[PDB]
Amino acid sequence: MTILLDLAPEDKEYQSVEEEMQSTIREHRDGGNAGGIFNRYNVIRIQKVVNKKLRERFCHRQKEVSEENHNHHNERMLFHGSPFINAIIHKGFDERHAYIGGMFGAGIYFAENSSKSNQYVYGIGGGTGCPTHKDRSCYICHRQMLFCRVTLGKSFLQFSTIKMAHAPPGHHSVIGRPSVNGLAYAEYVIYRGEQAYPEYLITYQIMKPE
Ligand SMILES: C[C@H]1Cn2c(nnc2C(F)(F)F)CN1C(=O)c1cccc(C(F)(F)c2n[nH]c(=O)c3ccccc23)c1
Ligand SMILES: [Zn+2]
């Protein structure tokens, strides 16, 4: 079903992924409570996820999205942090696990900031942290995140995403726009699992500042 291909640290692809991961780090409102306190990652390994069935579904949907949006599928590389990596790399993203609540809408969420996704590696609010030390700011335990191909199509920009079950008419995605009375960092939402491909699996550690 799924095959992982190791990228060499000296390869252009690995370097591109690491630089996007490192450059998108930001200071979060919670002062590092959910994701830990760091200004750098120590990248352990980067793997390319190979899943035939997932690629088929992704490519088929991309063709549809572009055919609806004047031949522009608007593909974006976005981060996804989750304690359910294994399920995602084998089954893909699934909007059926999502629902309307006080924090999120019924969708598949992505960040353009790696540090935002890092806040969800151990669950909502960082859960209880690493299973070994129960520390949300663990500098030892190897963390994992995904760097995904996301078919955005025509995106709808809005201040709040909690009431969304699908994109508005003629749109394919929703973007939670940063605001003074809202989000500090952008949220990217799709409502179909076929609109994302979990391309890269990043294994890393957060680094403790000097
Ligand atoms: C239903 C879940 C789990 N989910 C999905 N597909 N399969 C599953 C699973 F049940 F198997 F885990 C798709 N899904 C998500 O996308 C999702 C939905 C709501 C909230 C979150 C999140 F809060 F946990 C989150 N995580 N990771 C981020 O990088 C992130 C970036 C910006 C904002 C919020 C977040 C994720
Ligand atoms: Zn730990």
From Swiss-Prot:
Protein name per its UniProtKB record: Poly [ADP-ribose] polymerase tankyrase-1
Binding residue positions for Zn(2+): 130, 133, 138, 141
Domain named PARP catalytic: residues: 8-210
Post-translational modification comment from the UniProt entry: Phosphorylated on serine residues by MAPK kinases upon insulin stimulation. Phosphorylated during mitosis. Ubiquitinated by RNF146 when auto-poly-ADP-ribosylated, leading to its degradation. Deubiquitinated by USP25; leading to stabilization.
Record localization: Cytoplasm; Golgi apparatus membrane; Cytoplasm, Cytoskeleton, Microtubule organizing center, Centrosome; Nucleus, Nuclear pore complex
Subunit structure: Oligomerizes and associates with TNKS2. Interacts with the cytoplasmic domain of LNPEP/Otase in SLC2A4/GLUT4-vesicles. Binds to the N-terminus of telomeric TERF1 via the ANK repeats. Found in a complex with POT1; TERF1 and TINF2. Interacts with AXIN1. Interacts with AXIN2. Interacts with BLZF1 and CASC3. Interacts with NUMA1.
Expression tissues: Ubiquitous; highest levels in testis.
Full-protein residues shown: 1106 to 1314 of 1327
Organism for this UniProt entry: Homo sapiens
Function of the molecule: Poly-ADP-ribosyltransferase involved in various processes such as Wnt signaling pathway, telomere length and vesicle trafficking. Acts as an activator of the Wnt signaling pathway by mediating poly-ADP-ribosylation (PARsylation) of AXIN1 and AXIN2, 2 key components of the beta-catenin destruction complex: poly-ADP-ribosylated target proteins are recognized by RNF146, which mediates their ubiquitination and subsequent degradation. Also mediates PARsylation of BLZF1 and CASC3, followed by recruitment of RNF146 and subsequent ubiquitination.
Organism superkingdom: Eukaryota
Outcome following mutation: residue 187 to A: Loss of activity
Assigned protein family: Belongs to the ARTD/PARP family.
Effect of mutating residue 80 to A: Loss of activity
